[PDB]
Amino acid sequence: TGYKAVDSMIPIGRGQRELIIGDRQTGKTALAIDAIINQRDSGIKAIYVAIGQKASTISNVVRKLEEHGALANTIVVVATASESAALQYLAPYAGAAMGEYFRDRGEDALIIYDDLSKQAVAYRQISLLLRRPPGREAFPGDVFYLHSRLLERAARVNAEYVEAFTKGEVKGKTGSLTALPIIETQAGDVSAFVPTNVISITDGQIFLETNLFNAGIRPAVNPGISVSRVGGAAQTKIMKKLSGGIRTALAQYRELAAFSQFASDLDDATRNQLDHGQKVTELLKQKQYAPMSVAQQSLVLFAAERGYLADVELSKIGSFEAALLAYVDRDHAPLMQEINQTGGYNDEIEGKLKGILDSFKATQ
């Protein structure tokens, strides 16, 4: 999606809704913004919604929209700081309306809803305004039904949508509806009955760590605290192939971390668990604005596949000399055509992966 790790952690497919917890004033709207890179690039069917919106954020946002190459690849209607608590509740209802003209079109429908709390306490100042006893937080517990009815829709492409669009003039065909959740709270509080039951409905749950981008590491998110059920099934044969070691350093690096707990406790082996754990930790990054190549999929599979575990081990040479391997692509990136074309594990490539690593010697 714009992080190599974006896919890497949890690939997916149409029909899916995964929660990603989010961080205030951390970018987790601007990170949440940083998402769309591949999407505008995707030029594929998606939607997004916002309520109570901020005209500045609106404006500059649009600036990005043009900045976003597509800007037309998907549409959104807009609802501002005066959008009715009613209307707040309304937009989630709204999307399906012509969203069919993808899902029913058998096209992937896809959506994004955010600030759902606005719909909730919308139903609160509603409910207290209704002088009606609501659930806790003065809003009725409909969120179950409200997000039963609401949360139901996501339909992965399937042809018992046999009437979808033309009914079925086939259109006998596969209604695809991929759901885009937005999960954030101050502290990210799950005790919300909303975050409780809602949390349950999630076909994925991603915790975002304020820590990385907090101490500044541009990608901030909380891995493995981030847990999505779809996963690298959608990681293609190589992506399927090479995707393994993640939780490892999540263990290992962090496992390596544990050694510090006793001052001066480390072992050369463990030292290698901070070489892979901590040094391979030094490997990964995703920017404030990060696209992801997925021909970068190869770029990933290098470190193990190439000697890039060792090769250019210096973060100086990792960032630097690796970028100089992006040069070696400048030098030699003929076949990547056939690669991103391919997107799958074939050792035949893997030869070109080793000799690639030779070009990496050439690429330093």
């Binding site: 004033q25 901020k54 005209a55 306490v121 100042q125 207290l128 305004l129 003065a138 101050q186 001052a263």
Partner: protein
């Protein structure tokens, strides 16, 4: 936004805010008092007069005694007035404080209205008021209105929609805190969270951008060290920690700075401080260049050289 309850220097920090405010002032603007200590308005107003300042600036004055109808009342006056200025003066600018008065007033009103108070008592929908006004304000084609304001942080209650909801509308967040007060820093406030949205590493360069990232770390660094240092004492540490805490006391102290307005609160004025120097010494302690200057010299520091002039003397 300016957080902090009163007593925080929410105003007293706001004093130097008036100093450098004036330093940069140079505009067509007006301001007025609300829920304010009376003679504060008296003689302060007499500083405007002393400054002869009321020229561009009419002032309504609210007092701590005021009516709630008065408190929230002065609002729509802000409305119609801004309608006058920002349009009229395409320059419109103001600063304000202590709105937790007003917001709170709405809260009490709700049940007082017989309206369902909001959850835990506020005006049931009062955020409607919030983004209603935050809505209702713009630096306009009609005219650009620069402004800033405070509200009593609800005894610094964050989840207080005063602070909680507040985080929404504001471009850059601020806190007048017991922290640097607990630190005794001349600021006596909490920045560390505050976000300058305008800081782009493009814009900042990595002069400001990079230096900043190093802040995020070193923050986490000595910050982290607090834990086990607390545990065993700091003995167990690799010395490099002591390098961090070194630049912590030192450089952190260096942030504490002479500021001219100090003269009032801190009988001595401090010093205006230019940013290029901030990159400069930013390198220096970044280099730990001097490394000799006490954190003390760094504490309430003048500029790098001024704190290095210290470093000679101090």
């Amino acid at each position: 936004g300016l957080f902090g309850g009163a007593g925080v220097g929410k105003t007293v920090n706001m004093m130097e805010l008036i100093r450098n405010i004036a330093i940069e002032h140079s505009g067509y603007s007006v301001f007025a008092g609300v829920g304010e200590r009376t003679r504060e308005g008296n003689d302060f107003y007499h500083e405007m007069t002393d400054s002869n300042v009321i020229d561009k600036v009419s002032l309504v004055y609210g007092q701590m005694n005021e009516p709630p109808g008065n408190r929230l009342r002065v609002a729509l006056t802000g409305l119609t007035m801004a309608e006058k200025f920002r349009d009229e003066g395409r320059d419109v600018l103001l600063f304000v404080d202590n709105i937790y008065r007003y917001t709170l007033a709405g809260t009490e009103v709700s049940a007082l209205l017989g309206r369902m108070p909001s959850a835990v008592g506020y005006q049931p929908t009062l955020a409607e008021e919030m983004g209603v006004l935050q809505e209702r304000i713009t630096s306009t084609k009609t005219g650009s209105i620069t402004s800033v304001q405070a509200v009593y942080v609800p005894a610094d209650d964050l989840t207080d929609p005063s602070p909680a909801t507040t985080f929404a509308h504001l471009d850059a967040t601020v806190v007048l805190s017991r922290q640097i007060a607990s630190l005794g820093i001349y600021p006596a406030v909490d920045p560390l969270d505050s976000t300058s949205r305008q800081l782009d590493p493009l814009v900042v360069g990595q002069e400001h951008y990079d230096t900043a990232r190093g802040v995020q770390s070193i923050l986490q660094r000595y910050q982290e060290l607090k834990d086990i240092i607390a545990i065993l004492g700091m003995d167990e540490l690799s010395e490099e920690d002591k390098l961090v805490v070194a630049r912590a006391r030192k450089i952190q102290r260096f942030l504490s700075q002479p500021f001219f307005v100090a003269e009032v609160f801190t009988g001595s004025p401090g010093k205006y401080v230019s940013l290029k120097d901030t990159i400069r010494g930013f390198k220096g302690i970044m280099e730990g260049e001097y490394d000799h200057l006490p954190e003390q010299a760094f504490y309430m520091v003048g500029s790098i050289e001024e704190a290095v002039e210290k470093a000679k003397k101090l």
